[PDB]
Every structure is written in structure tokens, then in C-alpha cells.
């Protein structure tokens, strides 16, 4: 099972440069992104996927700014980055699902708006 440096919640203000939801796998064993699939979920909906085999990201229209930094994925960094305007209406539990060839894991982070 993939294990994570878990975080219960992160907060942001409109003074934040950008919204970053952390997801860090500590025992990642993939050696090329073709072996990797990343799914981000919110309120039961898939709001970001990265298909490493096809080098293809998919987002719904209400998360059009969401992205991950693919150069960091094999270090275990699947953190989701999005604009504040996409985040402010979607506070709550986010789920990060990371899948390799034979192993996978998921972790939950609550995004909060604070001031």
C-alpha cells in the first residue's frame, strides 16, 4: 500500500499566491510516469486525473485551473494546484488517489478558507 506524509487540512486566504493541496507518497516505487495514475476527488466527483501513460490531464469545467507538477510525481509529489477562484467555492474534503503498476493508496485533505 502506498503510504503518505498525511495532512489533515490546509487553509488559504485570498492573499495566498496559489492554492496547493498537498499529497506526498513516501514509498513511491514507480520509475517512469507511464506507470502512474493520479486521481483527485471532491464530494464524490473526479475533479482531476493525470494519465501518465498518455501524458494527459483531465479536469471538469469548474476546476479548469487544476494541475499537478508532473516533474515531481516520481518523487511522490502529487500535490494539486489550482486558482483561488476555483478553490473558494470548493472547500471541504479532497481525496488524492495514486496508483502504480501493482500498488496504490489514497489520502484525504480538508481545504479550508480562513482569514
Amino acid at each position, epitope marked *: 500500500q502506498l503510504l503518505f506524509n498525511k495532512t489533515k487540512s490546509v487553509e488559504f486566504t485570498f492573499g495566498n499566491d496559489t492554492v496547493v493541496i498537498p499529497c506526498f507518497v513516501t514509498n513511491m516505487e514507480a520509475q517512469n510516469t507511464t506507470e502512474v495514475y493520479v486521481k483527485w476527488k471532491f464530494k464524490g466527483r473526479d475533479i482531476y486525473t493525470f494519465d501518465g501513460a498518455l501524458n494527459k490531464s483531465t479536469v471538469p469545467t469548474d476546476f479548469s485551473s487544476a494541475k499537478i507538477e508532473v516533474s515531481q510525481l516520481l518523487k511522490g509529489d502529487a500535490s494539486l494546484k489550482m486558482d483561488k477562484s476555483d478553490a473558494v467555492s470548493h472547500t471541504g474534503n479532497y481525496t488524492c488517489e495514486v496508483t502504480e503498476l501493482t500498488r*496504490e493508496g489514497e489520502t484525504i485533505i480538508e481545504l479550508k478558507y480562513r482569514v
Partner: antibody, heavy 118, light 108 residues
Framework: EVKLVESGGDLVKPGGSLKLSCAASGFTFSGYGMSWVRQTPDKRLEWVATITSGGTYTYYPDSVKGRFTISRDNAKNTLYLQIDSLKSEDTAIYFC???????????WGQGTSVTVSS | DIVMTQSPATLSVTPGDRVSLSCRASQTISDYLHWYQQKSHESPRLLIKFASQSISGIPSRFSGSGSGSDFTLSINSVEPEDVGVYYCQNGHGFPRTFGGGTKLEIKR
């Protein structure tokens, strides 16, 4: 075109050893995980081994763990499966497959036949 | 020890039918489920990955759906050349396991 060609299948006696080979072409071999799947005479499929694209990590089901070894030579674009302490249940057609996340196997070879029998 | 169930084992259908094939997982695997077809005297080929993503070069009449524990491969307007065995495979859960296969037969 992606092409995978297995070889090395043969009739072998129980307790013997066998090394299967798979030559790969048509893609960047070193950029993909690889797997072996076998199909028994009842036509059921069983995954038996997977290796990451750099060769470092190997994965096996419990049925074969400890006596199958998967390996690869990325300079030679070749995949290997070494089978030790063979049992009659290892009689099957053995396929090499290119693998993706979740072990989705988007290209397969034609297979090589192994029969374990005295 | 995840178990993948395909029922029925054999399915006879009519050309032009919209056919649905079933796969059931002994545990939740979300949408991490793949579909293969193996025609007679061929090796399997990937039809659908992750429950519903089509594969390049596969005929457009194949599609997949479902999440969690129950999955469906659809063939809209099945053809005689579609005869063969269809296998599901979990993308989550260990080990990576194949269902027993559903053999598709064409009625004539």
C-alpha cells in the same frame, strides 16, 4: 508498430528450471513497466510477474513468489522470466505484456507454451 | 485475495443487439477495472482501461461503465467478428486478477 515476441517455452520436468525471453520493439522499452501473464489449459488468465521500467522493483502473486524471477535488459530491449522449482500447475501459455498504471496491459506477445511433465 | 466474477460464462446474442457484459468485484475498486477481448487463436487485447476509457484502435462500438464493485462492458450493435472471450481485470486490489471470462456467441 509495437511488437513483443516471446520464446523459450519447452517441455520441462517437474522441479526443473526454465528461462523465458521476450524481445520488444516499436516503442521505448525502458519507458514502460512490463509483465508476464499465463493462460492455463482451462483458458483462465493469471498475472505472474511485473517489473518497473528501470528494473528495480519486481512484484509477484503469492502463487509464484519465491520461485519466479522477472528481469529486463533495457540496452537489449529484452524481458526475461526465470521459472524455478517447476510444478505441473505451471503448465500454461506465457505472454509478455507492456503494462501501464493499474497493470493495464495494452500490448501482448503471441505467447510461448510451457509444459511441466515427467 | 480479490475475486473477480463474470456471469454468465457464455452469452449468445443477435447481430445488431446492444450487448452488456457483467463483471463483479469482491471489494470496492472504484473505476480501476480493465476489459480485454481474446479472439480464438489470438492473444488478449486491451479494450477499455479504468472502467470507461477507450483504447486507440478499438472499434467505437465498445464502451464501459460502472464504478465501485459492478462494471459493464457495452457493445452497441454487436457484429459476427466480435465472437470471443471477454475478461475483466482489477486495477486496484492485490493481486491483479482476471475474471473467468464471458464467451460471446453469435446466434444465426
Amino acid at each position: 508498430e509495437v511488437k513483443l515476441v516471446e520464446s523459450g517455452g519447452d517441455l520441462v520436468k517437474p522441479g526443473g528450471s526454465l528461462k523465458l525471453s521476450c524481445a520488444a520493439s516499436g516503442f521505448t522499452f525502458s519507458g514502460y513497466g512490463m509483465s508476464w501473464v499465463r493462460q492455463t489449459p482451462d483458458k483462465r488468465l493469471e498475472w505472474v510477474a511485473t517489473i518497473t521500467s528501470g528494473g528495480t522493483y519486481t512484484y509477484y502473486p503469492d502463487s509464484v513468489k519465491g520461485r519466479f524471477t522477472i528481469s529486463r535488459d533495457n540496452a537489449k530491449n529484452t524481458l526475461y522470466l526465470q521459472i524455478d522449482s517447476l510444478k505441473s500447475e505451471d503448465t500454461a501459455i506465457y505472454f509478455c505484456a507492456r503494462s501501464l498504471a493499474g497493470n493495464a496491459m495494452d500490448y501482448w506477445g503471441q505467447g510461448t507454451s510451457v509444459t511441466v511433465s515427467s | 485475495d480479490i475475486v473477480m466474477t463474470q456471469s454468465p460464462a457464455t452469452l449468445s446474442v443477435t447481430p445488431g443487439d446492444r450487448v452488456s457484459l457483467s463483471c463483479r468485484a469482491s471489494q470496492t475498486i472504484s473505476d480501476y477495472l480493465h476489459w480485454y477481448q481474446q479472439k480464438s487463436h489470438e492473444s488478449p487485447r486491451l479494450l477499455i482501461k479504468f472502467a470507461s476509457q477507450s483504447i486507440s484502435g478499438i472499434p467505437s462500438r465498445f464502451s464501459g461503465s460502472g464504478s465501485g464493485s459492478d462494471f459493464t462492458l457495452s457493445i452497441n450493435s454487436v457484429e459476427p467478428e466480435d465472437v470471443g472471450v471477454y475478461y475483466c481485470q482489477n486495477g486496484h486490489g492485490f493481486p491483479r486478477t482476471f475474471g473467468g471470462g464471458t464467451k460471446l456467441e453469435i446466434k444465426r
